[PDB]
Amino acid sequence: ETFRLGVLPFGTASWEAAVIKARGFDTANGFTLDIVKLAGNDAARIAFLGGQVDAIVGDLIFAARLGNEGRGVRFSPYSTTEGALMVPAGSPITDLKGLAGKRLGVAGGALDKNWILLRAQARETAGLELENVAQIAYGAPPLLAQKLETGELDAALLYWQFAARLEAKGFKRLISADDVMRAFGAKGAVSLIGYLYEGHTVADRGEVVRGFARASAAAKDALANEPALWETVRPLMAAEDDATFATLKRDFLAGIPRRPIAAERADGERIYAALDRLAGAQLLGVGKSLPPDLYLD
Ligand SMILES: O=C(O)c1cc(C(=O)O)c2c(n1)C(=O)C(=O)c1cc(C(=O)O)[nH]c1-2
Numbered sequence: 001e002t003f004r005l006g007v008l009p010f011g012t013a014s015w016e017a018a019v020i021k022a023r024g025f026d027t028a029n030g031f032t033l034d035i036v037k038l039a040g041n042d043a044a045r046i047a048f049l050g051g052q053v054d055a056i057v058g059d060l061i062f063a064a065r066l067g068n069e070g071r072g073v074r075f076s077p078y079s080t081t082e083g084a085l086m087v088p089a090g091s092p093i094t095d096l097k098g099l100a101g102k103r104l105g106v107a108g109g110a111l112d113k114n115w116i117l118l119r120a121q122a123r124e125t126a127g128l129e130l131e132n133v134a135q136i137a138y139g140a141p142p143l144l145a146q147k148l149e150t151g152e153l154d155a156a157l158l159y160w161q162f163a164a165r166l167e168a169k170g171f172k173r174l175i176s177a178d179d180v181m182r183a184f185g186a187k188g189a190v191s192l193i194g195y196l197y198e199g200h201t202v203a204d205r206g207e208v209v210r211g212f213a214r215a216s217a218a219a220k221d222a223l224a225n226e227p228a229l230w231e232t233v234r235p236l237m238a239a240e241d242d243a244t245f246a247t248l249k250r251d252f253l254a255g256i257p258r259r260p261i262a263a264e265r266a267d268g269e270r271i272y273a274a275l276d277r278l279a280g281a282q283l284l285g286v287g288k289s290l291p292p293d294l295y296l297d
């Protein structure tokens with residue numbers, strides 16, 4: 001039995017995929033993991049829609065959209081670490097209002113989960129619509145990070161893993177999406193990033209799905225229990241700089257999901273429902289409610 005996992009080249013899923021393969025955690029679960037390299041999220045989402053993989057990593061809001069749009073997709077928590085709003089070190093910007101007039105890169109486009117969270121936060125706290133006051137530039141995270149470094153952007157909302165290298169190059173993480181959800185009043189760590197499993201794989205190859213889910217949990221557990229294992233996966237982390245490697249490890253470990261699925265489901269449902277309520281409007285990208293049976297039991 002082969003399980004096809006689509007991965008991004010700048011993503012963190014490759015790290016645990018490499019542990020699964022090296023430690024034989026796929027073999028231990030009766031399957032072979034096939035890592036499918038996808039160039040970007042757009043291509044990954046099409047590979048998912050085209051049935052070219054058994055799973056990709058993605059966000060709960062996208063998963064809810066696919067589900068509302070008719071897909072049998074299932075979501076399993078991958079990480080509670082998400083999002084990084086990066087500004088130059090020494091920036092006068094201590095708040096979201098200070099983004100006014102700034103060239104702001106936003107990874108993933110106008111429907112990105114981190115952008116929906118940030119826009120909701122700025123509406124709730126400052127009654128401000130960031131798309132009206134900031135010069136928004138959408139793009140893939142690598143591009144945004146490079147253009148923030150070259151000075152064409154003044155700030156950028158990126159995937160969390162981009163903070164460490166930028167911190168080594170003159171930038172500071174002002175806020176995370178985790179900071180935003182704790183401001184909302186979330187008490188529990190919320191996984192907004194998860195494995196998205198194809199409905200057809202869940203229906204006809206459910207034990208391969210469960211075997212991969214077990215292999216992933218075992219790989220995350222190994223990384224949290226065996227500091228030596230990180231040095232084996234370092235080549236895949238783009239972390240030749242020592243502070244970058246340490247920061248990546250710290251934030252990955254902090255994001256390992258450690259709550260029961262029922263609690264994860266209730267928190268996701270409340271944050272989802274809260275989005276529009278905190279925003280004071282129907283945020284584009286967010287449905288009235290989560291589609292039914294979205295979470296993998
Ligand atoms: O917001 C974030 O911080 C964040 C982090 C990551 C990650 O851990 O690589 C992903 C995403 N978002 C994301 O939205 C996504 O679709 C994704 C795919 C992958 C991957 O490795 O294949 N990582 C991530």
Ligand SMILES: [Gd+3]
Nearest residue numbers: 057058059062
């Ligand atoms: Gd996605």
Ligand SMILES: [Gd+3]
Nearest residue numbers: 071072073199
């Ligand atoms: Gd499906």
Ligand SMILES: [Gd+3]
Nearest residue numbers: 029214215218
């Ligand atoms: Gd096992």
